[PDB]
């Protein structure tokens, strides 16, 4: 876990500006844009204005960190988690000046992935496991992870493992789109788009407004509307079916765990305080910024119907070499779905289905906007006619929510 730590603290140094708070509420002095730095600054003023005096003790032994933290975080009243965090590592070194709590958040965000609690699949990716019910108390563990995550946001602390963009979208209660499903289940997504596009009453297919899932062998059949199991998907109603199926796929097998996480979060940091962030900003707020190395990225990128020498590839690397780091990370999220980089850099980039390098493919014509497939870390780049056209389209597309 040591290599992850060095990279962890280094993100704390790159990201210091993220701890700045607005001074007054009255605005800059005079000498649509997303306004991230200012939303972050106003969020910190909000938490800081809502901090409570004194502290809560958190007393952990390293060899037993998760269970001890679970016990002690769960027994504190939720709003007592807005006092100062004071963490002691039992019989070890000195006192918490803030530094041991940074350690604690780092170690906790990793210790939660330990297989013996069965909460998550399999790393820095948290995907809730449907079979988490194996653990009879998994609902109370998810509350704790909800409280633990809010505490980090409240206290301006980072964690080294995060959820996926569509998950943070439900956490900000944004309407999930079918393009989001592509990011979570491409086969399910292909079949939804197939149904939408082709005649079902001439394929002879027969589907019903009901869907089923299999968890540790036990199959359970959920109805998408009243009577849906007897209702036939026809040419007339297949748009509704696609809608309810998209919604249902985002939390399949994990509805209960997700409510236990959200409610635990909401008790510490009301979800409303986040309403103006988007899911990419929320993701960065939890794990920090890092500098994005352009050289490693460029030599581990792969092209479909483009080359090193296509003029749009040249323009793309010129766009990247000349934008700020905050823009490079946001393009990283557009294309890969995360701001995080694997330990081994871009040569080790991974897709949902095994290894997959950052990929740029030529599709369509000059009038199209850029599209992403985050599951295959593939950027669909139209053959634009000029650098300025490329810059403006790529900029509009990484910024679009």
Author numbering: 430 to 460, 543 to 633, 638 to 916
Sentences copied from the publication:
The Nedd4 family E3s have nine members in humans (WWP1/2, Nedd4/4 L, Smurf1/2, NEDL1/2, and Itch), which share a common N-terminal domain architecture comprised of a C2 domain and 2–4 WW domains that are responsible for subcellular localization and substrate recognition, respectively. Each HECT-type E3 contains a characteristic HECT domain at its C terminus, which catalyzes the transfer of ubiquitin from E2 to itself and then to the specific substrate. The HECT domain adopts a bilobal structure, in which the E2-binding N-lobe is connected by a flexible hinge loop to the catalytic C-lobe. To prevent excessive ubiquitination of targets and self-destruction by autoubiquitination, HECT-type E3s normally adopt an inactive state characterized by intra- or inter-molecular interaction.
To elucidate the molecular mechanism governing WWP1 autoinhibition, we determined the crystal structures of WWP1 in its fully inactive (2L34HECT) and partially active (L34HECT) states at resolutions of 2.3 Å and 2.5 Å, respectively. In contrast, the presence of the adjacent WW domain(s) together with L (e.g., 2LHECT or L34HECT) led to dramatic decreases in WWP1 autoubiquitination, suggesting that both WW2 and WW34 are responsible for ligase regulation. Both 2LHECT and L34HECT mutants possess slightly elevated ligase activity compared to 2L34HECT, indicating that they adopt a partially active state. In the L34HECT crystal structure, WW3, WW4, and the entire L region were well-resolved. It seems that the WW3 and WW4 domains are packed closely together, WW4 binds to the same “Le” site on HECT, and L forms a kinked α-helix that resides at the same “H” site that spans from the “Re” site to the “Le” site. Compared with 2L34HECT, WW4 and the N-terminal part of L are rotated ~35 and 25 degrees, respectively in L34HECT, and a few N-terminal residues (aa 413–416) in L were not observed. Importantly, although the 35 degree rotation of WW4 and 25 degree rotation of L appear to be significant, the crucial WW4-HECT and L-HECT contacts in the 2L34HECT structure are preserved in L34HECT. Our assumption is that the WW4-binding N-terminal extension of HECT is a flexible loop, which allows HECT-bound WW4 to rotate a certain extent upon crystal packing with a symmetric molecule in 2L34HECT; whereas the 25 degree rotation of the N-terminal part of L is the result of the missing WW2 domain and crystal contacts. We further validated the functional relevance of the WW4-HECT interaction in L34HECT. The point mutation at the WW4-HECT-binding surface (H517AWW4 or Y543AHECT) severely impaired the WW4-HECT interaction. Meanwhile, mutations at the WW4-HECT packing interface in WW4 (E503A, H517A, and H517Y) or HECT (Y543A, Y543E, W549A) led to significantly elevated autoubiquitination of WWP1 L34HECT, further demonstrating that the crystal packing-induced rotation of WW4 does not affect its inhibition in HECT activity.
